[PDB]
Amino acid sequence: PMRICSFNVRSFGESKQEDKNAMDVIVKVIKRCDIILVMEIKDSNNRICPILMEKLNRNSRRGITYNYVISSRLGRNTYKEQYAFLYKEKLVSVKRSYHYHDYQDGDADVFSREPFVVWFQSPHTAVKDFVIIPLHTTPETSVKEIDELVEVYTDVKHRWKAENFIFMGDFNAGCSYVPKKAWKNIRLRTDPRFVWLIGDQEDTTVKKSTNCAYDRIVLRGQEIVSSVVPKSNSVFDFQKAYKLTEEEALDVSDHFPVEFKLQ
Ligand SMILES: [Mg+2]
Ligand SMILES: [Mg+2]
Ligand SMILES: [Mg+2]
């Protein structure tokens, strides 16, 4: 069974490479996953190659090799981020990737960080291919941004043959950003063909004082939905798993990763 993870790593820049403790936790988290979306990559050179070197040192299983695809730098101006997908080479490959663009009226309007959509081929799963649409919203505009994910789904269906979709990332989908009353105006929730694997009662925040399901996974496509391994869909508490204190865990990230498994 293949594990797919999304992980918001707070400010993953050159500085973070120097905290060996935090970096070792991040590597361990990645090593549990066959595909992992990493968000908040911030660098104008290369942080994604150091990570691959680190992950490919034990050249183990004569081939548990990892590769990556990374988006362009996305934002309004000086403040840019990248989405990266790290994946086990021998288990999946990238068929195509593109940056969503709204050809109608306002062209850079809704997303500050346009989804970097990636079409994966997966010869060993029941579902032979799927598309991952990642999103990292700006907190105060999460209602609109999450809602607009149905327009990305439409665009991808027009462009590619694809039937199976995974929407994942940091939607900021809780607490004061997306209150209970606002779910009514989000088509990604009110259309029930979209299946939510992380529910509104989950805690994706490392801090003990907060309990919000900021990070999410949503599927569409009857094939992929019915291929989810029962009980696999969860928050991975890396703090409890590696016996870290709150301070050590906050050095890694402010967010826990979310994940599920596919048959
Ligand atoms: Mg942040
Ligand atoms: Mg945030
Ligand atoms: Mg918490």
Author numbering: 20 to 282
Quote the study's own text:
The enzymes responsible for clearing antigenic DNA from serum have been identified as Dnase1 and Dnase1L3 (deoxyribonuclease 1 like 3 or Dnaseγ); yet, the activities assigned to these two enzymes are not synonymous. Dnase1L3 uniquely degrades antigenic forms of cell-free DNA, including DNA complexed with lipids and proteins. Dnase1 and Dnase1L3 are both Ca2+/Mg2+-dependent endonucleases with a high degree of identity in the active site; however, the catalytic mechanism of the Dnase1-family remains contested.
Full-length Dnase1L3 was refractory to crystallization, likely because of the flexible C-terminus; therefore, we expressed and purified a form of Dnase1L3 missing the last 23 residues (ΔCTD) for the structural analysis of the core domain. Dnase1L3 ΔCTD was crystallized at pH 8.5 in 250 mM MgCl2 in the P1 triclinic space group with four Dnase1L3 ΔCTD molecules in the asymmetric unit. The core Dnase1L3 enzyme was refined to a final resolution of 2.2 Å with an R-free of 23%. The crystal structure of Dnase1L3 exhibits the classic 4-layer α-β sandwich architecture similar to other members of the exo/endo phosphatase (EEP) family of enzymes. The Dnase1L3 core enzyme structure superimposes with human Dnase110 with an RMSD of 1.8 Å across all C-α atoms. In Dnase1L3, we observed three divalent cations, with two Mg2+ present within the catalytic site. Our high-resolution crystal structure of Dnase1L3 provides the first experimental support for the two-cation catalytic mechanism, wherein His-155 and His-274 act as the catalytic acid and base residues, respectively. Using the nomenclature from Guéroult, the ’II’ and ’III’ structural cations are absent in Dnase1L3. In the Dnase1L3 crystal structure, which lacks DNA, Arg-132 interacts with His-155 to decrease the pKa of His-155 favoring the deprotonated form. In addition to the previously predicted Glu-170 to Arg-206 salt bridge, our structural analysis shows that Arg-206 forms an extensive salt-bridged network with Asp-166 and Glu-167.
